[PDB]
Design an enzyme around this catalytic site. Structure first.
Site, PDB file in Angstrom:
ATOM      1  N   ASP A 111       4.686   3.317   3.518  1.00 56.13           N
ATOM      2  CA  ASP A 111       5.600   2.245   3.959  1.00 56.13           C
ATOM      3  C   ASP A 111       7.069   2.529   3.605  1.00 56.13           C
ATOM      4  O   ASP A 111       7.615   3.505   4.114  1.00 56.13           O
ATOM      5  CB  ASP A 111       5.112   0.883   3.487  1.00 56.13           C
ATOM      6  CG  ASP A 111       3.700   0.548   4.012  1.00 56.13           C
ATOM      7  OD1 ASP A 111       3.139   1.316   4.838  1.00 56.13           O
ATOM      8  OD2 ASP A 111       3.140  -0.486   3.572  1.00 56.13           O
TER       9      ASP A 111
HETATM   10  C1  LIG Z   1       0.283   5.468   3.624  1.00 59.57           C
HETATM   11  C2  LIG Z   1       1.025   4.684   4.658  1.00 59.57           C
HETATM   12  O1  LIG Z   1       2.263   4.689   4.694  1.00 59.57           O
HETATM   13  N1  LIG Z   1       0.268   3.999   5.515  1.00 59.57           N
HETATM   14  C3  LIG Z   1       0.813   3.221   6.623  1.00 59.57           C
HETATM   15  C4  LIG Z   1       0.179   1.824   6.770  1.00 59.57           C
HETATM   16  O2  LIG Z   1       0.625   0.972   5.742  1.00 59.57           O
HETATM   17  C5  LIG Z   1       0.580   1.184   8.096  1.00 59.57           C
HETATM   18  O3  LIG Z   1      -0.167  -0.010   8.247  1.00 59.57           O
HETATM   19  C6  LIG Z   1       0.375   2.148   9.283  1.00 59.57           C
HETATM   20  C7  LIG Z   1       0.916   1.580  10.594  1.00 59.57           C
HETATM   21  O4  LIG Z   1       0.679   2.442  11.699  1.00 59.57           O
HETATM   22  O5  LIG Z   1       1.056   3.358   9.024  1.00 59.57           O
HETATM   23  C8  LIG Z   1       0.603   4.058   7.890  1.00 59.57           C
HETATM   24  O6  LIG Z   1      -0.771   4.351   8.058  1.00 59.57           O
END
Ligand SMILES: CC(=O)N[C@@H]1[C@@H](O)[C@H](O)[C@@H](CO)O[C@@H]1O
Ligand SMILES: CC(=O)N[C@@H]1[C@@H](O)[C@H](O)[C@@H](CO)O[C@@H]1O
Ligand SMILES: [Mg+2]
Lengths: 734, 745
Positions: free
Chosen positions: B305
């Site tokens: 995130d």
């Molecule tokens: C580890 C990470 O940053 N995961 C994020 C997740 O939080 C989010 O909901 C998603 C949206 O497409 O993208 C990524 O998977």
């Protein structure tokens, strides 16, 4: 009737040649028969007695060595280790430090001549003061001590110890005088000879062999084998700069016709062509003065003749003869302007290599017939040993049928070409000068790398449309002719056939876009309008026109969304369905959008069409593009409306009846001519129709050895059914 | 035993959480009355840049911003109108009209690449449309414009995904502006006071969201898990100009439509922006961590995130004083992304499945996915330990699935057992392997990623390299071309791998035209190094007409680029039996048909020696068209379909290996493993601490006096392990199992 046929001969077979000439309606032989007699003539060979005394006047070639790794500040480079020593020998007479080049391939820089020497006793160059861990090559001049084609026949037939014919270069005045004096005398010595069949003239197409007696480098249009210290010095005085060895070896590409042409190549072509043409005219003049016809073989030593360049008519050649391998190579011969007549040498060759030869013979006829109806050739004939073919009575009957069908076409059409339903222009770097010659490496031998593009020519060769060949220079200087309906651009990126960096010229892009926008049609095959690195987000510069680009790993962050494929469409209307395949495709459906993976790509392929070599990661530029085939997560076939005009993308197009039909429909669709498609069409893709309006007839041909049923649709809207047998042909009233 | 395990919980669920906590040996609870009573370490999620609409609605010019690129608009005359927003999600993004467009925006002729003078364009007062005049007909035009981000991208993702309907959209904020920054820090100060029960502040995450932009159809339009699109503002850009002495163009962000994908060869402007941003992000994360420590709390960072600017693999990360990183366990590679992070006290995996109705619904068996995720992470964990595990979401969902609940019990117990037996030490690595690319250590385990844990058609043939290595018995490091040019190749490295398509960060682009790089690698291989090239290694377009892969001489293979069609290609006969392919399943019917059909005889313009029928047996993923052996002394191991998939070449003391692509599987990980031992002339070291069966792996712990053998599948597996002394032991491993035996200490 009778005529329009060239029967080959041999000794001690005089009686059967009379019977086979009578049976085949032959009017020419290659004596008391009253026939036209052809004699093969070989200007630059067959005189070892001359050339052995003038060995510095053989043709020469710049050869590039293997890349040799330096492992310290010195390196030794063997010259001859990768070449056939029986064919090629280093030129030690012309100052190596003046005429050769040592290149550091790792940096692209030329090694200072003060830093290399040629060994006195070995064919090896010693380079000093170099950088370790770089690769080095030598580009050196080499005499050609064995005529490439004679050598190929020697090796192929296994002529064992037969003396090797040494070739000669008439660029040298001593050798030129010899050649013209010899031909003069030869003419006087040959009162029986009606046609001088020059096979061919002065410069062999690039054809070099390796140390293992295999082909090493080949280019049917290549002029590697055309240099000499004298020619090179004279070029410099005429063109006003010195050519590098690199301008010939081309980093190892040897100026393949697939390379985007450089100024140096065109200059060399111009120079060589002026010389070749004047000498060819002289040979034609001598033949004529002796009351004989002059005929040129389209191949072997044909370099510098340029049959599709302006002025070829001025040579006064009576004829061109060529090898019929397929429709494309038929058109190569048939379309040549400025000779009185044309001849195809048909297959099989009359040669030993249980068997039924009629099959090949009728196939060859069909491959070519469809082209001939579009662009007639004056005469047909076969080569070789007539006694060998006399044995196979079914083959003899085959030929009688072909010679008759051939003459009947002429009788019905008066040698007029069938009427063409659309004007199609193929656009590439070469244009008219390489008409029907795009995508060829070795004559008549498409391969894995080329067949997805050669298929376009092969399809077009026998198609009911008018094909012409135009260059980027034509387009830039004059715009697009008002009579053209469709432009085709196709090939891989960074080739003469797509065009390379010409696509970064805003004028070219303006001209095409404006023309399509006004009602033009643009068909791109493979990587059309491609230009690497010019725009990060656009590879095909006309991606907006055809609705398709190729992902080049610069745009992976941008999700690609594919609209649903349209399975029922005019372009794919003749593609054999396959209910259980279509059902599986409909049931599996399309990918749901997923982060970083876009969406809408079908999970199973629809299939049914052979698109040849894939172009990876093609995708639609927006969801208003019509996808017709987009299997395996990428795009094979698409169409896009662009103002009043249309673009079409095809990833590749191997020749077949199905794929010729597909391309034909593409052509009518893209030019908004769907309603023009019905007239003079066969419902069956395996058959084609030729309409001859001013003779008030049409014909339909079976392109196969199969019975084929088809419905022809006339201009007036009526239809007529046919049931054609093997290689059949029916004629009707129009 | 008990511990190393984080349990999620929820309101009105004290009895079941207590029960599961005890069952799973949980020592932490992730956010109730009687649960707080249990004596567990309490985690609370914190969201610095959102969850305060009452602040940001009153300061809307302090939302984060992003440079956006419009669609290409075709001019059909000397004027052209360009809509700004038609291609974008208007609930997420809006054009910044506040900041002077003539200072901050660019109209570009995409046909020529020229910037249109700003005298020649005006922004319509009433519509989101730019009017351009004085241009060229039949050219394409675009605008690059600043837009406010008015909906937090991850919040929005969750809203659209879970159908939240009319629920209020959370507006994100940007701490670069001083007012928002004070709000954020005052609010965190206040929250710490209001939260005496909380032990761990689980920042999810910090200040800047990874590039995540949606389209007018509410679909993902642009995503880069590493992207810093969403990090600009008029003030930030002007401050950057002052500091670095040059102005960034809008182009330096939209990058012609690429938006600075991690696959693009990194430009100087990208690295300067990362340096600037991480200076700012890091000073502020440190403040958060200091405020947490002073309140008696740990500060834990989610690897995801809003993690842009943190740079966990760049030097100085340890100075932030973060106690932990937690991340999503998606596979082995994503496990290593977390495990290998230096400069925190501990690391944590959040395992799958997430406790949510998309997985926990009647008729689904979430235990299969639960155990599959464990198997994938466990093979990587043996090579690089993570301190803790846990799960997220609704415990009440998981509780309805007794089979799943019992599967977690097993996993938690095995996780702790591996830790108590190895003492948290990494397994011994048998070779030192370096992945070489433009990014190096700063993107350790992060090569080939677009969206986190979602390899796709375009990337899976290269991502499989990392997935194979993630649990493999070798030591893997990530190195940059700058490292190699500055310092040469470190003397402990056995194998260098360079993989990817042409003109990407992963192969390296025009760096391969730098003679010093070519010199350094060649001399190293000649001296006994090993170079493994995958896809289009060392590739450089146009530089040499007759050589595309610059190190084609090392690996023995180049790619035909349609420049060398006049040169006949001659392929030596394939060698079907070889060390590298020794574990490939034999298919006697394929081998017979391939043997019978034989090889193509030389033909003019077609070369010779290509097999007429494929041998097959190995999935190499996406084809690399028209690869060919550079001479006949190269060993071809697979060359089906008139091109090359697998080859090896001796190069002095060393060796090069070419592989066209490598999707992850047990078989391909074994193939890569064999390639590494073979290329480094270490065939003699292969057998020690190895499993005969490619479906199992061995981890050796010399300092503990043990080894283990793990079954990477859900089927029983028999395997023979070979010890260092050449003795063997046979195992019959159950579904997903593990066995431990003594080794010499
Ligand atoms: C580890 C990470 O940053 N995961 C994020 C997740 O939080 C989010 O909901 C998603 C949206 O497409 O993208 C990524 O998977
Ligand atoms: C039309 C033409 O030039 N044909 C030649 C043929 O004469 C020759 O024997 C062969 C050798 O590879 O090449 C070409 O096919
Ligand atoms: Mg000597």
């Amino acid at each position: 009737s009778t005529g329009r046929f060239t029967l080959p001969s041999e000794e001690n077979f005089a009686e059967k040649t009379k019977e086979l000439a009578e049976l085949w309606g032959a009017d020419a032989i290659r004596l008391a028969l009253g026939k036209k007699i052809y004699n093969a003539y070989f200007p630059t060979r067959a005189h070892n007695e001359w050339i052995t005394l003038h060995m510095d006047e053989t043709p020469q070639v710049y050869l590039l060595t293997d890349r040799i790794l330096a492992e310290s500040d010195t390196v030794d480079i063997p010259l001859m280790e990768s070449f056939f020593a029986e064919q090629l020998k280093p030129n030690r007479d012309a100052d190596p430090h003046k005429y050769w080049e040592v290149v550091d391939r790792t940096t692209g820089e030329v090694v200072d001549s003060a830093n290399w020497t040629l060994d006195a006793d070995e064919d090896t160059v010693h380079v000093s003061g170099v950088a370790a861990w770089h690769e080095y090559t030598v580009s050196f001049l080499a005499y050609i001590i064995w005529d490439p084609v004679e050598m190929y026949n020697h090796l192929t037939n296994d002529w064992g110890d037969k003396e090797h014919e040494i070739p000669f270069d008439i660029y040298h005045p001593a050798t030129r005088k010899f050649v013209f004096d010899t031909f003069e005398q030869w003419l006087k010595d040959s009162p029986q000879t009606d046609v001088v069949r020059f096979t061919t003239f002065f410069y062999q197409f690039t054809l070099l062999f390796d140390e293992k007696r295999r082909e090493k480098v080949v280019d049917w249009f290549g002029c590697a084998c055309t240099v000499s210290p004298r020619a090179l010095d004279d070029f410099e005085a005429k063109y006003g700069y010195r050519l590098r060895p690199e301008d010939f070896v081309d980093g190892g590409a040897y100026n393949s016709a697939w390379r985007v042409p450089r100024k140096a190549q065109r200059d060399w072509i111009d120079f060589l062509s002026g010389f070749v043409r004047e000498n060819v005219k002289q040979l034609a003049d001598m033949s004529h003065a002796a009351g004989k016809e002059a005929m040129m073989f389209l191949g072997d030593q044909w370099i510098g003749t340029e049959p599709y360049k302006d002025g070829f008519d001025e040579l006064g050649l009576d004829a061109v003869v060529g090898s019929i391998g397929d429709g494309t190579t038929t058109r190569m011969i048939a379309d040549i302007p400025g000779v009185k007549y044309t001849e195809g040498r048909f297959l099989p060759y009359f040669f030993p290599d249980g068997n039924d030869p009629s099959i090949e013979g009728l196939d060859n006829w069909r491959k070519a017939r469809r082209a001939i109806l579009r662009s007639p050739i004056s005469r047909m004939g076969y080569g070789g040993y007539l006694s060998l073919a006399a044995k196979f009575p079914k083959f003899v009957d085959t030929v009688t049928h072909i010679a008759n069908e051939f003459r009947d076409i002429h009788d019905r059409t008066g040698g007029v070409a069938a009427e063409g339903e659309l004007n199609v222009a193929i656009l590439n770097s070469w244009g008219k000068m390489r008409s029907w010659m795009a995508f060829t490496v070795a004559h008549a031998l498409p391969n894995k790398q080329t067949y997805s593009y050669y298929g376009i020519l092969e399809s077009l060769s026998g198609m009911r449309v008018n094909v012409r060949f135009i260059s980027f220079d034509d387009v830039l200087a004059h715009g697009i002719d008002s009579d053209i309906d469709v432009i085709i651009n196709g090939g891989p990126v960074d080739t003469a056939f797509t065009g390379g960096d010409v696509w970064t010229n805003p004028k070219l892009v303006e001209t095409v876009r404006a023309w399509v926008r006004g009602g033009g049609a643009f068909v791109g095959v493979g990587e059309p309008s491609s230009a690497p690195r010019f725009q990060t987000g656009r590879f095909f510069q006309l991606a907006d026109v055809i609705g398709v680009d190729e992902e080049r790993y610069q745009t992976l962050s941008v999700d690609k969304y594919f609209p649903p494929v349209v399975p029922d469409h005019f372009i794919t209307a003749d593609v054999p369905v396959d209910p259980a395949a279509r059902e599986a495709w409909e049931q599996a459906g399309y990918r749901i959008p997923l982060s970083g993976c876009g969406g809408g790509q079908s999970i199973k392929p629809l299939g049914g069409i052979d698109f040849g070599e894939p172009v990876l990661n093609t995708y639609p530029v927006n969801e208003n593009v019509t996808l017709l085939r987009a299997d395996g997560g990428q795009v094979q076939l698409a169409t896009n409306d662009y103002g009043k005009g249309r673009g079409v993308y095809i990833s590749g197009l191997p020749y077949s009846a199905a794929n010729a039909r597909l391309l034909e429909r593409v052509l009518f669709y893209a030019s908004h001519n769907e309603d023009k498609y019905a007239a003079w069409s066969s419902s069956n893709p395996e058959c084609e129709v030729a309409h001859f309006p001013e003779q008030g007839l049409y014909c339909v041909i079976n392109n196969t050895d199969q019975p084929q049923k088809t419905t022809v649709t006339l201009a007036d809207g009526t239809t007529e059914d046919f049931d054609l047998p093997d290689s059949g042909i029916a004629w009707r009233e129009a």
